[PDB]
Design a protein around this ligand. Structure first.
Ligand code: FAD
Length: 295
């Protein structure tokens, strides 16, 4: 019943950009844009936790057409306007100074996307992925560990769980469990979707907990900059206690090099009860309750 590959690279769906808005506020590091595309005219359907491909125009340095780049869907299946007519992405402009000598490098697809104008036609493929799907059980617990744009799939979950319009549109899913997002970014201006995330926590204090790891504004107990692995270590016992529930699911996105720190913290917590985390975790993965998507 899960939609998959309704459109492929050889015959992509040609969508139209509706809006391209900045998510990084003044004083933040980098550029991250929220881009919404019109899906009318096609049959692209999708669910929370999936991704779509974007095929940028142009050729690479070898003269070959550019290939698709995958992006985690940032909107629920109904789209940001809950009209089942759009899809949104959370795109960071990739930019890095080339080693040994000044000159900055700009990622092809991400720069194309972050600077795209409303009305422009875009080649879209997908949806893709069955690794980050949300359980249908409204009483499940959901732990979300994310950094930067890794917030994308989490937004799809949280919006479906807590937006008034979503709850009205999803009679079959009235979330009543507990969800906890631990979000790591460099600055407060970099907290993507800050206002809406905090709105949700204020409205659902018993169903949603929000924890930040802001590196340029906070220090861990050792004096270093605060990162997501530090927050997990800080709340290791609480997280492990939740993970023990047969209905708890954990989602990780964007922790390229944080996963090891995460496991170290949970391992120490589980060890107190004579449990080897690495083994317990392997079983969670097999059971489909430990979801990971890092790149
Ligand atoms: C499943 C999945 C989901 C994703 N979701 C998102 C998302 O939601 N938001 C998002 O912004 N991106 C996401 N990405 C990443 C995205 O697919 C692209 O890889 C990213 O946007 C950069 O592509 P680009 O075309 O702009 O850069 P490209 O032109 O393809 O260049 C990228 C290349 O530059 C090089 N490079 C990058 N950084 C450095 C560095 N610091 N030092 C030296 N070389 C470097 C590497 O060789 C890398 O392959 C996701 C990826 C996957 C696989």
């Amino acid at each position: 019943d899960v939609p998959v590959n309704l459109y492929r690279p050889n015959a992509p769906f040609i969508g139209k950009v509706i809006s391209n808005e900045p998510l990084v506020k003044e004083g933040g590091i980098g550029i991250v844009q929220h881009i919404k595309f019109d899906l009318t005219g096609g049959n692209l359907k999708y669910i929370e936790g999936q991704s779509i491909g974007i095929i940028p125009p142009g050729v690479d340095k070898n003269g070959k057409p550019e290939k698709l780049r995958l992006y985690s869907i940032a909107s629920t299946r109904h789209g940001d306007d809950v009209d089942d007519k759009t899809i949104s992405l959370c795109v960071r402009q990739l930019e890095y100074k080339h080693p040994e000598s000044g000159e900055t490098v700009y990622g092809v697809c991400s720069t194309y996307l972050t600077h795209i104008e409303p009305g422009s036609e875009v080649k879209i493929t997908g949806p893709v992925g069955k690794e980050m799907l949300l359980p249908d059980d409204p009483e499940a617990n959901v732990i979300m560990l994310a950094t930067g744009t890794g917030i994308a799939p989490m937004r799809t979950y949280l919006w479906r769980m807590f937006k008034d319009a979503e709850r009205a549109a999803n009679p079959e899913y009235q979330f009543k469990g507990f969800s906890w997002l631990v979000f790591g970014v460099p600055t407060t201006p970099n907290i993507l979707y800050k206002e809406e995330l905090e709105e949700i926590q204020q409205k659902y204090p018993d169903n949603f907990r929000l924890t930040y790891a802001i590196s340029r504004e906070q220090k861990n107990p050792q004096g270093g900059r605060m990162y997501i692995q530090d927050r997990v270590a800080e709340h290791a016992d609480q997280l492990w206690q939740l993970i023990k529930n047969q209905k708890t699911h954990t989602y990780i996105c964007g922790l390229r090099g944080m996963e090891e720190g995460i496991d170290a913290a949970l391992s120490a917590a589980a060890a107190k009860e004579g449990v080897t985390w690495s083994d317990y975790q392997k079983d969670l993965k097999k059971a489909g309750r430990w979801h990971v998507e890092t790149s």
